[PDB]
């Protein structure tokens, strides 16, 4: 056994990182990519001296002797601040993610945060919007449960070559009927001044899933003039003050929680009037 120790770069802009090697005391290197288990080729034996550019996936690397030291290479992904257009519905689930060069093969991998699913796409080019896509039938139950999912996408122009995978992105998504499940609970109206009320609600279930919740919207309806006003609220805030109310007028308040791609279902309406 040789006393060689590995190093790894941080994930670069290309979604690659070089596994390097140094000797400080025949031998060969066995490389096993753990992420994306549904791929056909998962291991390769290499000469120690050539130092491949891995992806952000998890790897097992071992020095094997020919007459074993092993390192579990941690995952190192790239996280997108922009949420993906993932739509889960009655007939199936569909994804869109930023594509790169043409004839690219993508592997989509997800797991509920806190059932490892794997999907391998056929080679596809970017659409006129610069996006790649894939869809699943309802039978697949692809992110059909109302939970927060962690997703990682990989890309390769030669999926049969293990050392050519690159990381695309990682992201979070709330599955199932997120619009309905995200409805805020415990909406309450409290007397704040002679002409104003404070509206408070419990944080949406979407707020526990990173990056999913875009904003809250508070709708107030004047039951006499039938006029309607909407007030957007930062997702870090669960309180808003409604002002300019008229005495004797009845009012209705509802709250909804919106994602980047879905309008949320309104809460049960609250009826009130100035005391």
């Amino acid at each position, epitope marked *: 056994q040789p006393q060689v120790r590995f190093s790894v770069e941080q994930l670069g802009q290309d979604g*690659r990182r070089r596994l390097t090697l140094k000797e400080q005391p*025949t031998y*060969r290197l066995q490389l096993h990519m753990l992420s994306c288990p549904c791929k056909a*080729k998962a291991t*390769r*034996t*290499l*000469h120690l*001296g*050539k*130092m*491949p*550019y891995l992806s952000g996936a998890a790897y097992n690397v071992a020095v094997i002797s*020919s007459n074993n030291q092993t390192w579990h290479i941690p995952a190192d992904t790239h996280t997108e601040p922009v949420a993906l257009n993932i739509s889960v519905g009655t007939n199936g689930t569909t994804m869109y993610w930023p594509a790169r*060069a043409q004839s690219m093969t993508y592997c989509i991998e997800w797991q509920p945060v806190g059932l490892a699913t794997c999907s391998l796409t056929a080679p596809q080019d970017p659409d006129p919007a610069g996006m790649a896509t894939y869809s699943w039938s309802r039978e697949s139950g692809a992110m059909g449960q109302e939970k927060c999912y962690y997703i990682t996408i990989f890309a390769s*122009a*030669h999926p*049969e*070559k293990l*050392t*050519l995978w690159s990381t695309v992105l990682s992201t979070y998504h709330f599955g199932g009927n997120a619009s309905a499940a995200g409805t805020p609970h415990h909406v309450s109206v409290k007397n704040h001044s002679l002409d104003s009320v404070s509206v408070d609600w419990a944080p949406s279930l979407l707020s526990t899933c990173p990056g999913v919740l875009k904003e809250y919207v508070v709708r107030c309806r004047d039951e006499d003039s039938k006029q309607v006003s909407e007030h957007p609220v930062q997702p870090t805030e669960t309180q808003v003050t409604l002002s300019g109310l008229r005495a004797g007028v009845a009012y209705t308040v509802q709250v909804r929680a919106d994602t980047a791609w879905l309008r949320g279902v309104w809460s049960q309406p609250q009826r009130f009037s100035i005391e």
Partner: antibody
């Protein structure tokens, strides 16, 4: 379409020098390793030299080590082979070949047309 | 350097025959082995990589196998455009080395 066009070939006297060039088009030159492969008349293929995508790695065959220098100019999509102290055995058709990865690895998926280099007085 | 020895150096066959070419390596190279086809006056064309992976666009009558030091290229049913020279090449370690070649000629 991917294309590799070699130039710079011709006649060179023994002991002199010659510089071959490869003009790449149809792909992102900065993302692939490149190699030179030569074939003497009526003989088999002989790998000459290879270079990684960022020019940090260079490798040479035994018969050309110390006499040849491979280099790349990624701003101009050009591959170079500097040949010094040429002998008669270096007479061959020199091909330009692309490697599919960042590093020098795997097979050659794209080749040039080749250029004849004759070393003779 | 790793020596790559092919067998046979040449062979004559007919259309429809099953052709088998062997490639042997002086050292173990696992699966880091490629196969090329070259016709007179043309650049080689890559047929097989990773000892057994069929390059895109190559007919399915071609196939490779083997690991370590012994590898075989097989043409299940020889076709007229398959008569040519075939080379193996290891990319396990530097310097990359080719085999001496195997010329597949037509029998008459």
């Amino acid at each position: 379409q991917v294309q590799l066009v070699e130039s710079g070939g011709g006649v060179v006297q023994p002991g002199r020098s010659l510089r071959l060039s490869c003009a790449a088009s149809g792909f992102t030159f900065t993302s692939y390793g490149m190699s030179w492969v030569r074939q003497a008349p009526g003989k088999g293929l002989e790998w000459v030299a290879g270079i990684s995508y960022d020019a940090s790695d260079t490798e040479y065959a035994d018969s050309v080590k110390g006499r040849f220098t491979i280099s790349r100019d990624n701003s101009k999509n050009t591959l170079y082979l500097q040949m010094n102290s040429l002998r008669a055995e270096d007479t061959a058709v020199y091909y330009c070949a692309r490697s599919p990865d960042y590093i020098i690895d795997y097979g050659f998926d794209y080749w040039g047309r080749g250029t004849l280099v004759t070393v003779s007085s | 350097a790793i020596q790559m020895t092919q067998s046979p150096s040449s062979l004559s066959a007919s259309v429809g025959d099953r052709v088998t070419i062997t490639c042997r390596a002086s050292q173990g190279i696992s699966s880091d082995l490629a196969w090329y086809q070259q016709k007179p006056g043309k650049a080689p064309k890559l047929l097989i990589y990773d000892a057994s992976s069929l390059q895109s666009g190559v007919p399915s009558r071609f196939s490779g196998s083997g690991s370590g030091t012994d590898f075989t290229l097989t043409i299940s049913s020889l076709q007229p455009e398959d008569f040519a020279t075939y080379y193996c090449q290891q990319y396990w370690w530097y310097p990359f080395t080719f085999g001496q070649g195997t010329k597949v000629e037509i029998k008459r």
